[PDB]
Amino acid sequence: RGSMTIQDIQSLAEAHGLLLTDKMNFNEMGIDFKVVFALDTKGQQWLLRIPRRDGMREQIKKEKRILELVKKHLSVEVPDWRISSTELVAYPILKDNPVLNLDAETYEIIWNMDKDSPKYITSLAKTLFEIHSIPEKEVRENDLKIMKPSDLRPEIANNLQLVKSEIGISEQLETRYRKWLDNDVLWADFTQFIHGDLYAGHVLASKDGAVSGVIDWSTAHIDDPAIDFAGHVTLFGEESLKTLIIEYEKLGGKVWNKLYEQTLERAAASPLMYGLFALETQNESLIVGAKAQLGVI
């Protein structure tokens, strides 16, 4: 970006009680945050998230609350936000690398783990169980979004009609979403605390596939549990999804007979959810990417 120097970053961090070496890497793929991998003067590795624009205070305080809450309930590491202002978010680096990363240029998937690892399935299922176990009372106490079963279909109906109007959508994708909305028996009669964007990019694991951490908690709220399975089906396939649901159930994960079906519809609905995102932001580059996934390109 060249928007700020290492000295500018050292000054920001020092102002929040963090003294940084001049050894820094950048990740500029984030639309909301400039990301920095930094070293403090004791050799501790830090992740800095520096907001790209003003107005993100509510977003940052909410994620802070979410991390404080999930920290009490998960066996795996989550970011420990020791700094959290409108100017800077900072946490010490966690134990393991993400399951995959994206090529800086092309956004090609680079697997850090053997995708076929069954230790990924057993450990991911345990984490899913602990996240989904987080009590509603505690969620309400933290002023987080709570979607009830009866809220889900109205909301997605409104998303469909909005995205069709503003971005456009293929006849085949629109009819799949309409059939999904009318297919009552797919929709669970309970909602649970979910990560809200749980896919391999946000899961930290050893090379053998043992999940040790989960990052990027900004989207966490009470909603359709199937949202937390959707990101698995794309990258790992339907057989792997079946193995995961079974492993989840064995732990006492609350399922229904159509969780499988709902997950596939949720995954097939990524282009609609990206439509929504790209539409709020108003970034023209993002709207064009949306059109492509929605099949109007």
Residue numbers in the entry: -2 to 294
The publication says:
Subsequently, the pathway involving aromatic aldehyde synthase, monoamine oxidase, and aldehyde dehydrogenase (AMA pathway) is introduced into E. coli Lys5 to produce glutarate from glucose. Module I contained two enzymes for converting lysine to glutaraldehyde, while Module II contained the last enzyme for converting glutaraldehyde to glutarate. In this study, an aldehyde dehydrogenase, ALDH, was isolated from K. pneumoniae to demonstrate its double oxidation capability. The simultaneous catalysis of the two aldehyde groups was verified through both experimental and mechanistic calculation methods, providing a enzyme that extends the existing aldehyde dehydrogenase library.
ALDH was identified as the rate-limiting enzyme in the AMA pathway based on three experiments: (i) Enzyme activity assay: Despite being more highly expressed than the other two enzymes, ALDH exhibited the lowest enzyme activity. Subsequently, ALDH was crystallized to obtain the protein crystal structure with a resolution of 2.28 Å. Each ALDH monomer was found to comprise three domains: an oligomerization domain, a catalytic domain, and an NAD+-binding domain. The ternary conformation was determined by molecular docking of the substrate glutaraldehyde and cofactor NAD+ with ALDH. Based on the catalytic mechanism of aldehyde dehydrogenase on single-aldehyde substrates, a putative catalytic mechanism of ALDH was proposed: Tyr-88 initiates a nucleophilic attack on the carbonyl group of glutaraldehyde; Subsequently, the hydrogen (H) on the synthesized hemiacetal hydroxyl (OH) is deprotonated. Simultaneously, the hydrogen (H) on the central carbon of the hemiacetal is transferred from the substrate to the carbon of the amide neighbor of the cofactor NAD+; Finally, the ester bond is hydrolyzed, resulting in the formation of glutarates. Our findings indicated that the reaction could not proceed under acidic conditions; and (iv) Key residue validation: When Tyr88 residue was mutated to alanine, its catalytic efficiency was significantly reduced, nearly reaching zero. The high energy potentials of steps 2 and 5 were caused by the suboptimal orientation of IN1 and IN4 toward the cofactor NAD+. Whole-cell conversion of Mu4 produced 9.9 g/L of glutarate, which was 4.0-fold than that produced by wild-type ALDH. Finally, the above mutant sites were combined to generate the mutant Mu5 (ALDHI90C/I212C/N94S/P95N/G210T), capable of producing 13.9 g/L glutarate from 20 g/L glutaraldehyde in 30 h, representing a 5.6-fold improvement over wild-type ALDH. The increase in the catalytic activity of the Mu5 mutant could be explained in three ways: (i) The k cat, K M, and k cat/K M values of Mu5 were 27.9-fold, 1.5-fold, and 51.0-fold compared to the corresponding values for wild-type ALDH.
